[PDB]
Amino acid sequence: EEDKAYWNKDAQDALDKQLGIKLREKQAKNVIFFLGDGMSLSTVTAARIYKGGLTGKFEREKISWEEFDFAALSKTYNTDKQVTDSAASATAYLTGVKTNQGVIGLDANTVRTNCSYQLDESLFTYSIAHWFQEAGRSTGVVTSTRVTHATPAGTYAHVADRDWENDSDVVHDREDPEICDDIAEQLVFREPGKNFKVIMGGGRRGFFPEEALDIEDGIPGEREDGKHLITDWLDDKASQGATASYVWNRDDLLAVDIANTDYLMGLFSYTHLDTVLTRDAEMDPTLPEMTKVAIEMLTKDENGFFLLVEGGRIDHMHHANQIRQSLAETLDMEEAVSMALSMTDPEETIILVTADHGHTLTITGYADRNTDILDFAGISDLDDRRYTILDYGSGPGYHITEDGKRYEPTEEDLKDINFRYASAAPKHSATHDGTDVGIWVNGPFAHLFTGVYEENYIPHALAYAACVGTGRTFCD
Ligand SMILES: *[C@@H]1O[C@H](CO)[C@@H](O)[C@H](O)[C@H]1NC(C)=O
Ligand SMILES: [Zn+2]
Ligand SMILES: [Zn+2]
Ligand SMILES: [Zn+2]
């Protein structure tokens, strides 16, 4: 039982672990970057307890990346807003430069929704994936979102508005698609996108025209310019004399011949991949499964590789105050981190986990230990109605009943994967949260992450340790 001796040994052991930390002052060969979108520190705590609910450890459970010796805090404000969107943050943590809301791979001179700015190369910021490529090393990206979503896009795109995932989105904002390249285009026609060995996620819709029909579902595509970008991608690999594979389902992914495959594009949905609690496990590969295949491919490169893996729908669930699903997405990513750790060598591989920004999730009192984190906390002493442990500062969960009272959540509500937990400030989609987020790191030079940093510091430190880019380097 958790008595005085128990806690003293628990602590003495942690101290013993801390004292035994051996620094790794050697170049990083590989860098695996995990990004939990909208994964606030509160999401991590809540998810630790959620996991504990499955394993029976409850509040004593540990999140995989919390076994790392190095954690840090990251300040996420951007050049025009206190609370960053996913685009400006991705530009910061992948290109090393902070920027305006809605802009990817361009600096703060950029005026959002203005394409001219994406024609000016002097305004370009370049990603750690670019840098790995310039050094002759392999790159890839896995995500549960559309592969043209802001996060993956930060590794390769330069656009004046994150909304421009395909040419139909450019036209929608009155811009000229002929000269304003959309993100899907940039992934297949430009560097570094065109050189990625592995591209996985969703978003097939931005890659083929309205006149064409989707693999799997037969839904017409979104492109309005007649371009079939997947076949463009395939033709490109083939004309280089390389083998390439396009897959769109789990069985096919797992059947891929790793040894004989140079390029891999796996697009498992028309749009974002289905959430953990709604996906067809037969048809959709999980985040860890995608991660495994990505690592299998990229590790063939003896000079090293960079891989971005995003737990992306964490954010989407928070936006709808759908906290149960948000926690399930989070754990899918926690499991992916474990998959990566078991497949790589920490003496040469940096594994970093962070968030782009948080969400306004809070953990209220006062439930007893071992209480399911999604359960009720107690009854309000002001209106006599139940309240949940988890709730939000912002979102559509705020609900005044027909009688003008605070909606009281039910047992049925709590079990419902679509139930929206209460918020303090009603909004159709919850805003992001501005609080500093966490960073957790293992491997070479993990001790570059000890304190509190601006969010754009991250890739500068990672470059130093991997010896890529044009800044200070360990090999320097
Ligand atoms: C967009 O930028 C260009 C280039 O400097 C400028 O000529 C144009 O008027 C700008 N458009 C708007 C709407 O500000
Ligand atoms: Zn985000
Ligand atoms: Zn994202
Ligand atoms: Zn968001």
Short mmCIF file of C-alpha atoms and ligand atoms in Angstrom, two decimals:
data_model
loop_
_atom_site.label_atom_id
_atom_site.label_comp_id
_atom_site.label_asym_id
_atom_site.label_seq_id
_atom_site.Cartn_x
_atom_site.Cartn_y
_atom_site.Cartn_z
CA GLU A 1 0.00 0.00 0.00
CA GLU A 2 1.22 3.58 -0.67
CA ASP A 3 2.70 4.32 2.75
CA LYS A 4 5.79 6.16 3.93
CA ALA A 5 8.28 3.42 3.01
CA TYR A 6 6.59 2.91 -0.39
CA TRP A 7 7.01 6.58 -1.37
CA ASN A 8 10.49 6.81 0.00
CA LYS A 9 11.67 3.81 -2.09
CA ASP A 10 9.70 5.11 -5.10
CA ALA A 11 11.61 8.39 -4.76
CA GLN A 12 14.99 6.88 -3.96
CA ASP A 13 14.69 4.77 -7.11
CA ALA A 14 13.92 7.80 -9.25
CA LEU A 15 16.87 9.55 -7.77
CA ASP A 16 19.02 6.52 -8.46
CA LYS A 17 17.79 6.66 -12.12
CA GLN A 18 18.54 10.37 -12.40
CA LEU A 19 22.06 9.96 -11.02
CA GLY A 20 22.78 7.24 -13.57
CA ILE A 21 21.92 9.43 -16.59
CA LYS A 22 24.68 9.15 -19.14
CA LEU A 23 24.93 12.08 -21.56
CA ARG A 24 25.07 11.37 -25.32
CA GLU A 25 27.37 13.80 -26.96
CA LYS A 26 27.48 12.16 -30.38
CA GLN A 27 25.91 13.04 -33.74
CA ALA A 28 22.36 11.92 -34.36
CA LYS A 29 21.99 9.68 -37.40
CA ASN A 30 18.19 9.59 -37.18
CA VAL A 31 15.48 11.96 -35.89
CA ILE A 32 11.90 10.77 -35.25
CA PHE A 33 9.64 13.74 -34.38
CA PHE A 34 6.23 12.97 -32.86
CA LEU A 35 3.65 15.73 -32.88
CA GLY A 36 0.49 15.50 -30.86
CA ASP A 37 -1.76 18.17 -32.40
CA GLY A 38 -3.44 20.21 -29.69
CA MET A 39 -1.88 17.81 -27.07
CA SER A 40 -1.80 20.12 -24.06
CA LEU A 41 0.00 19.09 -20.82
CA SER A 42 -3.49 18.53 -19.45
CA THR A 43 -4.18 16.09 -22.33
CA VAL A 44 -1.05 14.22 -21.40
CA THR A 45 -2.05 13.95 -17.72
CA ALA A 46 -5.60 12.93 -18.62
CA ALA A 47 -4.29 10.45 -21.12
CA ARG A 48 -1.87 8.95 -18.58
CA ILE A 49 -4.86 8.27 -16.30
CA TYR A 50 -6.99 7.03 -19.25
CA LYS A 51 -4.19 4.53 -20.04
CA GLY A 52 -4.13 3.60 -16.36
CA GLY A 53 -7.82 2.87 -16.61
CA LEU A 54 -7.04 0.25 -19.25
CA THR A 55 -4.12 -1.33 -17.52
CA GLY A 56 -5.37 -1.02 -13.98
CA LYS A 57 -2.50 1.13 -12.79
CA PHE A 58 -4.62 4.29 -12.96
CA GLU A 59 -2.79 7.41 -11.69
CA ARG A 60 0.42 5.44 -11.28
CA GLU A 61 0.55 4.58 -14.99
CA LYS A 62 3.21 6.16 -17.19
CA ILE A 63 3.00 7.58 -20.70
CA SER A 64 5.70 6.07 -22.87
CA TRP A 65 7.59 9.22 -23.53
CA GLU A 66 7.55 10.14 -19.84
CA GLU A 67 10.24 7.48 -19.39
CA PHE A 68 12.54 9.90 -21.16
CA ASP A 69 14.99 11.72 -18.91
CA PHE A 70 14.56 15.08 -20.60
CA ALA A 71 11.42 17.24 -20.66
CA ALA A 72 11.07 20.87 -21.53
CA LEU A 73 8.53 23.62 -21.99
CA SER A 74 7.73 25.34 -25.29
CA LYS A 75 6.30 28.82 -25.77
CA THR A 76 3.83 28.79 -28.66
CA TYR A 77 2.75 32.37 -29.32
CA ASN A 78 3.37 33.41 -32.90
CA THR A 79 4.09 36.73 -34.72
CA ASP A 80 0.48 37.97 -34.81
CA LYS A 81 -1.55 35.92 -32.27
CA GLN A 82 -1.18 34.87 -28.62
CA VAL A 83 -2.77 31.54 -29.41
CA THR A 84 -1.24 29.88 -32.49
CA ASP A 85 -2.94 27.82 -35.14
CA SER A 86 -1.40 24.65 -36.50
CA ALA A 87 0.21 26.30 -39.52
CA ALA A 88 2.33 28.97 -37.86
CA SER A 89 3.39 26.55 -35.19
CA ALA A 90 4.45 23.90 -37.68
CA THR A 91 6.53 26.57 -39.40
CA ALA A 92 8.20 27.27 -36.03
CA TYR A 93 8.95 23.73 -34.84
CA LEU A 94 9.84 22.40 -38.32
CA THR A 95 11.54 25.40 -40.02
CA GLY A 96 12.96 27.30 -37.01
CA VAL A 97 11.08 30.48 -37.59
CA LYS A 98 7.89 31.87 -36.03
CA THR A 99 5.28 33.42 -38.33
CA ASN A 100 1.74 34.66 -38.80
CA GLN A 101 -1.53 32.74 -38.27
CA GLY A 102 -2.40 30.59 -41.28
CA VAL A 103 1.04 30.78 -42.98
CA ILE A 104 3.26 27.77 -43.74
CA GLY A 105 6.96 27.92 -44.60
CA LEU A 106 7.12 31.68 -45.02
CA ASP A 107 8.14 34.36 -42.50
CA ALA A 108 6.13 37.07 -40.79
CA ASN A 109 6.37 39.36 -43.73
CA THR A 110 3.68 37.19 -45.18
CA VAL A 111 0.25 38.51 -45.47
CA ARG A 112 -2.17 35.59 -45.04
CA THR A 113 -4.27 34.63 -48.06
CA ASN A 114 -2.03 36.59 -50.26
CA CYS A 115 -0.33 34.31 -52.80
CA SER A 116 2.22 36.89 -53.96
CA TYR A 117 4.05 36.27 -50.70
CA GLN A 118 4.54 32.60 -51.54
CA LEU A 119 6.25 33.64 -54.83
CA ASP A 120 9.02 35.46 -52.96
CA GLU A 121 11.82 33.03 -52.13
CA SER A 122 13.51 35.47 -49.75
CA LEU A 123 10.52 34.85 -47.45
CA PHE A 124 10.95 31.02 -47.47
CA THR A 125 11.81 29.07 -44.36
CA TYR A 126 13.17 25.63 -44.85
CA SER A 127 12.32 22.55 -42.85
CA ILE A 128 14.40 20.07 -41.08
CA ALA A 129 13.36 17.62 -43.82
CA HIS A 130 14.88 19.89 -46.42
CA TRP A 131 18.03 19.95 -44.34
CA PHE A 132 18.24 16.21 -44.04
CA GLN A 133 17.81 15.97 -47.86
CA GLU A 134 20.54 18.57 -48.51
CA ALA A 135 22.79 16.32 -46.41
CA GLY A 136 21.95 13.26 -48.45
CA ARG A 137 19.63 11.60 -45.94
CA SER A 138 16.14 10.15 -46.24
CA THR A 139 12.85 11.79 -45.13
CA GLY A 140 9.22 10.84 -44.54
CA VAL A 141 5.94 11.82 -42.88
CA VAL A 142 3.17 9.80 -41.27
CA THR A 143 -0.08 11.30 -39.95
CA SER A 144 -3.66 10.52 -39.05
CA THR A 145 -4.73 13.71 -40.88
CA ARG A 146 -4.80 14.55 -44.55
CA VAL A 147 -1.14 14.61 -45.72
CA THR A 148 -1.78 18.22 -46.91
CA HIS A 149 -2.94 19.32 -43.38
CA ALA A 150 -0.87 22.09 -41.76
CA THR A 151 1.35 19.85 -39.69
CA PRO A 152 2.76 17.49 -42.34
CA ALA A 153 2.73 20.47 -44.71
CA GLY A 154 5.22 22.26 -42.50
CA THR A 155 7.83 19.73 -43.50
CA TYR A 156 7.57 20.66 -47.18
CA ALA A 157 5.24 23.46 -48.22
CA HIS A 158 5.43 27.23 -48.66
CA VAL A 159 2.01 28.78 -48.76
CA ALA A 160 0.32 32.02 -47.78
CA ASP A 161 -2.72 30.18 -46.48
CA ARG A 162 -2.87 26.73 -44.92
CA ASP A 163 -6.36 26.34 -46.37
CA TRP A 164 -4.85 25.86 -49.85
CA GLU A 165 -4.50 22.11 -49.65
CA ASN A 166 -5.64 21.66 -53.27
CA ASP A 167 -6.27 23.97 -56.27
CA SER A 168 -9.97 24.16 -55.53
CA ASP A 169 -9.11 25.85 -52.19
CA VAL A 170 -6.90 28.41 -54.01
CA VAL A 171 -9.71 29.25 -56.42
CA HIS A 172 -12.11 29.58 -53.48
CA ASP A 173 -9.99 32.46 -52.11
CA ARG A 174 -9.84 34.17 -55.55
CA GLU A 175 -6.26 33.33 -56.16
CA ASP A 176 -4.80 32.10 -59.44
CA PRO A 177 -4.16 28.35 -59.14
CA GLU A 178 -1.91 28.55 -62.20
CA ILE A 179 0.66 30.37 -60.30
CA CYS A 180 -0.32 29.70 -56.66
CA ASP A 181 0.80 26.14 -56.09
CA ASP A 182 -1.47 24.29 -53.62
CA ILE A 183 0.00 22.08 -50.92
CA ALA A 184 -0.74 18.79 -52.77
CA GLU A 185 1.06 20.12 -55.78
CA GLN A 186 4.01 21.16 -53.81
CA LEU A 187 4.23 17.71 -52.24
CA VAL A 188 4.54 15.98 -55.62
CA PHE A 189 6.32 18.60 -57.80
CA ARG A 190 8.68 20.47 -55.41
CA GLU A 191 11.40 19.82 -52.85
CA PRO A 192 11.52 18.56 -50.39
CA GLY A 193 8.18 16.85 -50.87
CA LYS A 194 9.13 15.29 -54.19
CA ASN A 195 12.07 13.54 -52.56
CA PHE A 196 10.28 12.00 -49.49
CA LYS A 197 10.63 8.20 -49.42
CA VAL A 198 7.59 7.73 -47.27
CA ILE A 199 4.27 9.65 -47.30
CA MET A 200 1.41 8.34 -45.21
CA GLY A 201 -1.89 9.63 -44.04
CA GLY A 202 -5.19 10.65 -45.57
CA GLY A 203 -6.43 13.26 -48.01
CA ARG A 204 -6.65 11.37 -51.35
CA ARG A 205 -9.24 14.00 -52.34
CA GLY A 206 -6.67 16.73 -53.00
CA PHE A 207 -4.76 14.54 -55.44
CA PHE A 208 -7.27 13.75 -58.19
CA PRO A 209 -9.87 15.70 -60.13
CA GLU A 210 -13.67 16.12 -59.68
CA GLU A 211 -14.07 14.10 -62.90
CA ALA A 212 -12.31 11.13 -61.30
CA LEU A 213 -13.52 8.87 -58.55
CA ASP A 214 -11.86 7.87 -55.31
CA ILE A 215 -10.29 4.52 -54.76
CA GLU A 216 -12.38 2.78 -52.19
CA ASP A 217 -15.37 5.06 -52.06
CA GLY A 218 -15.88 6.46 -55.51
CA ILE A 219 -16.30 9.94 -54.23
CA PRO A 220 -15.38 12.55 -56.88
CA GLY A 221 -12.08 14.32 -56.28
CA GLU A 222 -11.64 18.01 -55.36
CA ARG A 223 -9.05 19.06 -57.99
CA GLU A 224 -10.43 21.44 -60.63
CA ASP A 225 -7.31 21.48 -62.81
CA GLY A 226 -7.52 17.94 -64.21
CA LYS A 227 -4.36 16.88 -62.41
CA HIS A 228 -3.91 13.27 -61.27
CA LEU A 229 -1.11 13.81 -58.82
CA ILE A 230 -0.79 10.27 -57.63
CA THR A 231 -0.04 9.00 -61.08
CA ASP A 232 2.31 11.94 -61.49
CA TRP A 233 4.15 10.85 -58.34
CA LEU A 234 4.34 7.27 -59.50
CA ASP A 235 5.58 8.19 -62.97
CA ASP A 236 8.30 10.33 -61.36
CA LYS A 237 9.67 7.51 -59.29
CA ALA A 238 9.57 5.14 -62.23
CA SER A 239 11.36 7.52 -64.56
CA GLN A 240 14.22 7.69 -61.96
CA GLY A 241 14.49 3.93 -62.15
CA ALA A 242 13.12 3.48 -58.63
CA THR A 243 10.44 1.18 -57.41
CA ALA A 244 7.36 2.82 -55.94
CA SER A 245 4.19 1.68 -54.31
CA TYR A 246 0.84 3.37 -53.74
CA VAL A 247 -1.37 1.75 -51.13
CA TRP A 248 -4.71 2.74 -49.66
CA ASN A 249 -5.53 0.02 -47.13
CA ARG A 250 -4.03 -1.88 -44.20
CA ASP A 251 -3.50 -5.29 -45.82
CA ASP A 252 -1.78 -3.69 -48.73
CA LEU A 253 0.43 -1.61 -46.53
CA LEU A 254 1.52 -4.60 -44.52
CA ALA A 255 2.20 -6.57 -47.67
CA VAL A 256 4.70 -4.01 -48.94
CA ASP A 257 8.08 -5.51 -49.82
CA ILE A 258 10.28 -3.37 -47.62
CA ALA A 259 13.58 -4.53 -49.11
CA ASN A 260 12.56 -3.85 -52.71
CA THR A 261 10.64 -0.63 -52.24
CA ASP A 262 12.24 2.79 -52.66
CA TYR A 263 9.17 5.00 -52.34
CA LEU A 264 5.95 4.50 -50.48
CA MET A 265 2.78 6.53 -50.59
CA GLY A 266 -0.06 5.31 -48.41
CA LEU A 267 -3.24 7.35 -48.49
CA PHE A 268 -5.85 5.54 -46.46
CA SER A 269 -8.76 7.91 -46.72
CA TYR A 270 -10.43 10.45 -48.98
CA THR A 271 -10.06 12.86 -46.08
CA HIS A 272 -8.61 12.65 -42.55
CA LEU A 273 -8.24 9.02 -41.33
CA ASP A 274 -11.06 7.75 -39.18
CA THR A 275 -10.71 8.22 -35.46
CA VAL A 276 -9.41 5.39 -33.24
CA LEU A 277 -12.89 4.71 -31.79
CA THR A 278 -14.66 4.69 -35.17
CA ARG A 279 -12.10 3.23 -37.63
CA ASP A 280 -12.48 -0.13 -39.35
CA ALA A 281 -9.43 -1.95 -38.04
CA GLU A 282 -9.46 -4.22 -41.03
CA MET A 283 -9.19 -1.40 -43.55
CA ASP A 284 -7.14 1.25 -41.70
CA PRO A 285 -3.66 0.86 -40.38
CA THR A 286 -3.06 2.32 -36.90
CA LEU A 287 -0.54 5.03 -36.15
CA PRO A 288 2.00 2.56 -34.79
CA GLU A 289 1.57 0.33 -37.87
CA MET A 290 2.25 3.27 -40.17
CA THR A 291 5.17 4.23 -38.03
CA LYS A 292 6.63 0.76 -38.20
CA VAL A 293 6.53 0.59 -41.98
CA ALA A 294 7.93 4.11 -42.27
CA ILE A 295 10.85 3.22 -40.06
CA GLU A 296 11.32 -0.05 -41.93
CA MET A 297 11.74 1.91 -45.15
CA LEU A 298 13.72 4.93 -44.06
CA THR A 299 16.19 2.97 -41.99
CA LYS A 300 17.51 1.34 -45.13
CA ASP A 301 19.42 4.63 -45.52
CA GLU A 302 22.79 4.10 -43.82
CA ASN A 303 23.38 7.84 -43.62
CA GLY A 304 20.25 8.30 -41.49
CA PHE A 305 16.73 9.69 -41.79
CA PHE A 306 14.13 12.20 -40.51
CA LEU A 307 10.60 11.09 -39.85
CA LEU A 308 7.59 13.17 -38.68
CA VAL A 309 4.74 11.19 -37.12
CA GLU A 310 1.64 13.15 -36.21
CA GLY A 311 -1.16 12.21 -33.77
CA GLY A 312 -3.36 14.65 -35.55
CA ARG A 313 -6.95 14.11 -34.63
CA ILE A 314 -6.26 14.83 -31.00
CA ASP A 315 -6.93 18.39 -32.02
CA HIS A 316 -10.04 17.66 -34.01
CA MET A 317 -11.65 15.87 -31.08
CA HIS A 318 -10.77 18.68 -28.68
CA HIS A 319 -12.35 21.16 -31.14
CA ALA A 320 -15.66 19.37 -30.67
CA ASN A 321 -15.06 18.99 -26.92
CA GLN A 322 -15.09 15.24 -27.65
CA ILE A 323 -12.58 14.41 -24.95
CA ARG A 324 -13.02 10.64 -24.91
CA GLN A 325 -12.01 10.37 -28.56
CA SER A 326 -9.18 12.91 -28.01
CA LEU A 327 -7.68 10.69 -25.38
CA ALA A 328 -7.97 7.61 -27.62
CA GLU A 329 -6.10 9.43 -30.41
CA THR A 330 -3.49 10.47 -27.91
CA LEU A 331 -2.85 6.89 -26.85
CA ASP A 332 -2.59 5.75 -30.48
CA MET A 333 0.39 8.12 -30.64
CA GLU A 334 1.79 7.01 -27.31
CA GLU A 335 1.76 3.49 -28.79
CA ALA A 336 3.58 4.72 -31.84
CA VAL A 337 6.34 6.19 -29.74
CA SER A 338 6.76 2.80 -28.11
CA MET A 339 6.83 1.16 -31.58
CA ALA A 340 9.63 3.57 -32.60
CA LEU A 341 11.67 3.05 -29.42
CA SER A 342 11.61 -0.72 -29.91
CA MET A 343 12.86 -0.40 -33.49
CA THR A 344 15.69 2.03 -33.22
CA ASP A 345 18.93 2.56 -31.44
CA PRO A 346 19.01 5.37 -28.85
CA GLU A 347 22.73 5.74 -29.28
CA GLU A 348 22.01 7.11 -32.79
CA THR A 349 18.29 8.02 -32.87
CA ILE A 350 16.62 11.07 -31.37
CA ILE A 351 12.98 10.52 -30.51
CA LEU A 352 11.22 13.84 -29.66
CA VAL A 353 7.64 14.34 -28.73
CA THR A 354 5.86 17.66 -28.51
CA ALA A 355 2.64 19.49 -29.25
CA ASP A 356 2.14 22.39 -31.69
CA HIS A 357 -0.12 24.08 -29.20
CA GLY A 358 -2.60 23.04 -26.49
CA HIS A 359 -6.36 22.91 -25.95
CA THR A 360 -8.34 24.32 -23.08
CA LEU A 361 -8.79 21.02 -21.27
CA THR A 362 -8.86 21.09 -17.49
CA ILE A 363 -8.92 18.39 -14.82
CA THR A 364 -11.26 19.33 -11.99
CA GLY A 365 -11.59 17.78 -8.45
CA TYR A 366 -12.37 15.90 -6.56
CA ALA A 367 -12.72 12.24 -7.64
CA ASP A 368 -11.06 9.47 -5.77
CA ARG A 369 -8.05 7.68 -7.04
CA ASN A 370 -9.00 4.95 -9.57
CA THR A 371 -11.85 6.96 -10.93
CA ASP A 372 -12.24 6.76 -14.69
CA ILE A 373 -10.96 10.09 -15.95
CA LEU A 374 -14.05 10.47 -18.13
CA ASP A 375 -16.40 10.10 -15.16
CA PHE A 376 -18.30 12.58 -13.01
CA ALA A 377 -16.32 14.51 -10.41
CA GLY A 378 -19.20 15.43 -8.05
CA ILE A 379 -22.20 17.70 -7.70
CA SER A 380 -22.15 21.48 -7.84
CA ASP A 381 -22.92 23.26 -4.60
CA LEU A 382 -24.32 26.21 -6.54
CA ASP A 383 -26.94 24.46 -8.76
CA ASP A 384 -27.07 20.86 -7.47
CA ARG A 385 -26.27 19.29 -10.86
CA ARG A 386 -23.47 16.79 -11.62
CA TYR A 387 -20.20 18.01 -13.28
CA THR A 388 -17.45 16.07 -14.99
CA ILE A 389 -13.83 15.73 -13.96
CA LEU A 390 -12.77 16.85 -17.43
CA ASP A 391 -14.01 20.03 -19.04
CA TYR A 392 -12.97 22.88 -21.24
CA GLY A 393 -12.41 26.63 -21.30
CA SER A 394 -13.68 26.87 -24.85
CA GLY A 395 -15.99 24.92 -27.20
CA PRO A 396 -19.46 23.68 -28.16
CA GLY A 397 -19.89 21.70 -24.91
CA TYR A 398 -21.34 24.75 -23.17
CA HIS A 399 -25.08 24.13 -22.98
CA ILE A 400 -27.96 26.04 -21.30
CA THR A 401 -31.11 23.84 -21.22
CA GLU A 402 -34.55 24.87 -22.43
CA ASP A 403 -35.43 25.92 -18.82
CA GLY A 404 -32.41 28.19 -18.51
CA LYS A 405 -30.36 25.86 -16.32
CA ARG A 406 -26.93 24.30 -16.81
CA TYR A 407 -27.11 21.09 -18.78
CA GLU A 408 -26.55 18.16 -16.49
CA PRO A 409 -24.52 15.38 -18.07
CA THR A 410 -25.79 11.79 -17.77
CA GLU A 411 -24.26 8.44 -17.47
CA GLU A 412 -25.38 7.85 -21.06
CA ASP A 413 -23.74 11.11 -22.17
CA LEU A 414 -20.44 10.04 -20.68
CA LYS A 415 -20.32 6.77 -22.60
CA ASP A 416 -21.26 8.39 -25.88
CA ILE A 417 -18.15 8.86 -28.14
CA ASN A 418 -19.79 11.96 -29.65
CA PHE A 419 -20.73 13.65 -26.35
CA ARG A 420 -19.35 17.16 -25.93
CA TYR A 421 -18.04 17.87 -22.44
CA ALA A 422 -18.81 21.24 -20.96
CA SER A 423 -17.01 24.45 -21.81
CA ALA A 424 -16.86 27.86 -20.20
CA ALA A 425 -17.12 29.91 -23.39
CA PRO A 426 -19.38 28.69 -26.18
CA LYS A 427 -17.93 28.40 -29.63
CA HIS A 428 -18.88 26.10 -32.48
CA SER A 429 -15.24 24.90 -32.59
CA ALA A 430 -13.10 25.24 -29.42
CA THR A 431 -10.19 27.63 -29.73
CA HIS A 432 -6.64 26.34 -29.22
CA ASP A 433 -5.08 27.11 -25.81
CA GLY A 434 -2.08 29.45 -25.39
CA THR A 435 -0.37 27.74 -22.45
CA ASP A 436 3.14 26.47 -22.89
CA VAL A 437 3.27 22.85 -24.08
CA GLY A 438 5.63 19.97 -23.30
CA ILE A 439 8.64 18.54 -25.12
CA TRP A 440 10.13 15.15 -24.23
CA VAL A 441 13.30 13.78 -25.76
CA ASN A 442 15.43 10.64 -25.84
CA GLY A 443 18.71 9.90 -27.58
CA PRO A 444 21.68 11.84 -28.80
CA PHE A 445 21.78 15.32 -27.35
CA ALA A 446 18.47 14.93 -25.58
CA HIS A 447 20.10 17.23 -22.92
CA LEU A 448 19.69 20.13 -25.34
CA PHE A 449 16.10 20.16 -23.98
CA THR A 450 16.24 21.02 -20.28
CA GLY A 451 14.42 24.30 -19.69
CA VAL A 452 11.94 26.58 -21.27
CA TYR A 453 12.28 27.53 -25.01
CA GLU A 454 10.64 29.40 -27.76
CA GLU A 455 8.79 26.79 -29.95
CA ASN A 456 11.08 27.56 -32.96
CA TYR A 457 14.20 26.51 -31.01
CA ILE A 458 13.32 22.88 -31.50
CA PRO A 459 14.63 22.23 -35.06
CA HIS A 460 17.73 24.36 -34.45
CA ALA A 461 18.71 22.08 -31.61
CA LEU A 462 17.79 18.97 -33.61
CA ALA A 463 19.91 20.16 -36.55
CA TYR A 464 22.87 20.75 -34.28
CA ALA A 465 22.66 17.22 -33.06
CA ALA A 466 22.07 15.66 -36.41
CA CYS A 467 24.72 17.86 -38.19
CA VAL A 468 22.42 19.20 -40.87
CA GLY A 469 21.53 22.69 -41.95
CA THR A 470 23.52 25.95 -41.90
CA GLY A 471 23.71 26.84 -38.26
CA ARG A 472 25.88 25.63 -35.43
CA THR A 473 26.54 21.91 -35.73
CA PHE A 474 28.12 19.19 -33.52
CA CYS A 475 30.22 18.03 -36.46
CA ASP A 476 31.18 21.66 -36.97
C1 LIG B 1 -0.84 41.36 -52.46
O1 LIG B 1 0.55 41.57 -52.63
C2 LIG B 1 0.96 42.22 -53.84
C3 LIG B 1 2.50 42.18 -53.93
O2 LIG B 1 3.27 43.09 -53.19
C4 LIG B 1 0.23 43.57 -53.98
O3 LIG B 1 0.49 44.20 -55.21
C5 LIG B 1 -1.29 43.36 -53.84
O4 LIG B 1 -2.08 44.54 -53.93
C6 LIG B 1 -1.58 42.68 -52.51
N1 LIG B 1 -3.00 42.43 -52.40
C7 LIG B 1 -3.71 42.74 -51.32
C8 LIG B 1 -5.17 42.35 -51.32
O5 LIG B 1 -3.23 43.31 -50.34
ZN ZN B 2 -2.61 22.15 -34.20
ZN ZN B 3 -2.13 18.72 -37.16
ZN ZN B 4 -6.99 23.05 -34.26
#
